[PDB]
Each structure stands twice: as C-alpha cells, then as structure tokens.
C-alpha cells in the first residue's frame, strides 16, 4: 500500500517464529525499540500489528520515534515511546518500472501532523489560502497526494523500499500470539528435573500401567500429589516416582 494509505494486518492466535525475520538477510533495516526480537520468542501478546507500506530510501529514516518530515507528519507517524520493530528492504526490482511507477502515492499537504498510528486517506482538495476551494482545484487549492517516481535507474535514496512496522498490544484479554517454545527429548529410568506442559517437578519417569482418558493430562494421588503425566508429543502415560532418598 501507499504510505499515506498504509495497510495494517492484525496477527492473533498463532505462533510467531520471529527468527525467520531476524535471521533473514533480505532486510537492510531491522531496528527494534524497547524489545529484543530474540526475547519475543519467550513472550506472548494479545495482538500484533504489521503496518506495511512503501517509501523511498531517503525517507526510511523518518520511520522512527521522534522523527519529522513529509512521511512522519502527513503519511505515517510513530509515537515517541514506540515499542516494537521497524523492518525495511529495497524493492527496486518489484516497485520500479522503466517508464516510472507512479502507483505509489504520498500525502503532500495536511492541516496538521498525524497522531501516532493515525491513518489519513482523504482526497479533500487542500485549501492553501483563505478562499474556500469547495472541491475545486486552483490557486491555493491543491491535491493533497502526489505520486512517487520509481524507475530502476533511480538513486538508491530515491529507490522504492518496502517497510513493515511490528507493534505489540496487550489488553485485558488472553494473550494469543506466542513464541515457539521448543522442546527436547525425554529419558526414562533416570532421575530428571522435568517440566511438562504447565507443571514442573523432579523425579523418575517410568512406563505406566494406567489408562488415562483422551482429555486427561496430569495424574494425582490421594494426597494431592502429582503421580503420572501425559507426554505432550507422544501419547504415552509416564509414572512419576520421586527420586530415591533417605536418612544416613
């Protein structure tokens, strides 16, 4: 989408493998404010928002907190306390044309600067003077949008760049976007400190004799003590016998 009409995608209820992003070599700009993308794999959020658009290279700097200019003021504005990541990569091979690609537009006039994450797509004739325009262009009456000139021979500063801004949102609701949270192999007949789906403990895991129901996960003895567990990957029930101990 054009920067003045930047698209927003809402990411919810899924696993976000951020490595695919921060291990990629396809991005020239990858700058996260207030967060380390590695630690995102250990965090959950209610929602994520990917704001996607296209600008020229010289304007990439304007996509950052506390920045001013055409794009920041009139097209896309980040909050001064922005928490999240900005990713940008050259798109000359895709968004440029030999005759010049003008499909991408930017807002050239606006009566005031945009508030953070504000989106303005109006095509109102801009009244640059004291005479009302009444939707008619002319002296002191200009169209608020102007097309980018994107040619493959343009300088890298003037070449197209695709930009995606990842913002994270926590509400009074369950966090449904979570990291990978990989697992490891399991060993039996040896004292292990184990952490199954939500529970943790220490003991020896042994082949069991019980018949858990298809929906049961954690066993329980009479005296409210964990007794057996269902392995999350393998549909096998493991008895937890606490490791041997005794007085000397």
């Amino acid at each position, epitope marked *: 989408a054009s920067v003045y009409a930047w698209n927003r995608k809402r990411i919810s209820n899924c696993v976000a493998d951020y490595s695919v992003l921060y291990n990629s070599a396809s991005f020239s700009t990858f700058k996260c404010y207030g967060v380390s993308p590695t630690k995102l794999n250990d965090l959950c959020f209610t929602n994520v928002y990917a704001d996607s658009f296209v600008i020229r290279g010289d304007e990439v700097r304007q996509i950052a907190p506390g920045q001013t200019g055409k794009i920041a*003021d009139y097209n896309y504005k980040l909050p001064d306390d922005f928490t999240g990541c900005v990713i940008a990569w050259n798109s000359n091979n895709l968004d440029s044309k030999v005759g010049g690609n003008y499909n991408y537009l930017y807002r050239l006039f606006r009566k005031s600067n945009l508030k953070p994450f504000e989106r303005d797509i109006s095509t109102e004739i801009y009244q*640059a003077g004291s005479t009302p325009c009444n939707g008619v262009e002319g002296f002191n009456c200009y169209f608020p949008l102007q097309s980018y*000139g994107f040619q493959p021979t343009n300088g890298v500063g*003037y070449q197209p760049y695709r930009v995606v801004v990842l913002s994270f949102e926590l509400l009074h609701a369950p966090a449904t976007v979570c990291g990978p949270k990989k697992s490891t192999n399991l060993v039996k007949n040896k004292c292990v400190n184990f952490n199954f789906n939500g529970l943790t403990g220490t003991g020896v895991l042994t082949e069991s004799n019980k018949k858990f129901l298809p929906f049961q996960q954690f066993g329980r003895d009479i005296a409210d003590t964990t007794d057996a567990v269902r392995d999350p990957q393998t549909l096998e029930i493991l008895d937890i016998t606490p490791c041997s101990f005794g007085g000397v």
Partner: antibody
Amino acid sequence: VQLVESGGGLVQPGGSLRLSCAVSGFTVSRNYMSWVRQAPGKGLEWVSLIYSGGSTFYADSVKGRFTISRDNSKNTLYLQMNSLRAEDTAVYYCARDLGYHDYWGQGTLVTVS
Amino acid sequence: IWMTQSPSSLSASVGDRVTITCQASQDINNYLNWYQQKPGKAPKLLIFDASNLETGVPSRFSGSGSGTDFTFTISSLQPEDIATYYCQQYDNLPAFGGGTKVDIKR
C-alpha cells in the same frame, strides 16, 4: 498576490534580528513557507521551512541559530535570527513552496559586520 | 547529492536556441525545478518536475531530462530572457545549482 518582507538591517556579529513577511492572497499557516537567502554575488541558498502542520526544518548552516514561525491572525511569516555571523549577510526572501517555489517576495537585506 | 550546473556563463543572441545543463551526482528521477532571476529581482519559477512549464511562462522555455542529466531549453531567446538561471533538486534538501548567466552575444 504579493509577499512583503521587512526587518533587514545592519547588525554586529553575535547580534539578533527578526524578519517579518506579510502575505496577501495566501494563508501562511496553510502553506509550505520558506526563507531563502542570496549572498552578494552568489547563488540561492535555502534557509528554513515550516510545514502546514507546523513542523520546521533548517539548513545546516543556520541550525540552532535561526527559528521560523508564523502568526495566523496576521497571516505573516517570521524568521528569528540569533548569533548572527558575517556569512549571514544576504538578501532574504520569503517564498511559498508548492521544493518548487512559485511566489516570492521582493527581499530584505541583512548585513552583518 | 551534488548539483553541477554548466556552463557558468553562456553568450547567446536574440532568437537563438539555448541549452542549459544541470547535472546531479546521481539519479533524482524528475524532481527538478528551474528558476529565472534578473539583477535586483526575486527568482521566478519557470518549470517544475523537470517537464512542467509553470502557468503563464512563455512557450519558449522547455524543460526535459530524466535520471541524472537535465536540461532547460529556451527555443527562441527574447530580449527579456538574458538573466541568471538556477536548477534546484526537488523532494530533497532544496539543494541549488551554481547558476547559469545568459548574456548578449557580440
């Protein structure tokens, strides 16, 4: 349509001066308005700009010393200059920016010496 | 981006076809404007976006060029065209060219 600037004068280095630019036919607060200067016998040098939304920008040679502002009720653009230097000597024009500037004033002359 | 305008001075006669060249240090698409300035007068906008003659400017002034080499063409020089001409990079840091002075050939 005319841009009428005033306030230029002879002033010592380190002095201060405010330039005014009274506009007619154009609303300063609704336009990109710039100051541009021309040293004696030299070319044009852009000085400062104020966006319709209120943002201001400055050439590196004047950053931290000049301030551009405007008065909506008076439809007037201003350039406040501090810590003036000899190389600031120039005719100063105010212009409406469509970077392509179509409306220019007659200019006011600043001499710093 | 550095704007190199050539030549500094050029001599022409009334009715000649004049070509002024403005060279950018790299491709600036069509983001270029041309100005005309006479001694003691404010500059006058002639062409914007490298190929859009400003309203009211006579048909003589012709602008063209793309990428890194741009030209201002005065198809038929008239007495009131002897002046200094400036190019300016658009959608950037308002960088100006050094200027070209068109003078009376003899």
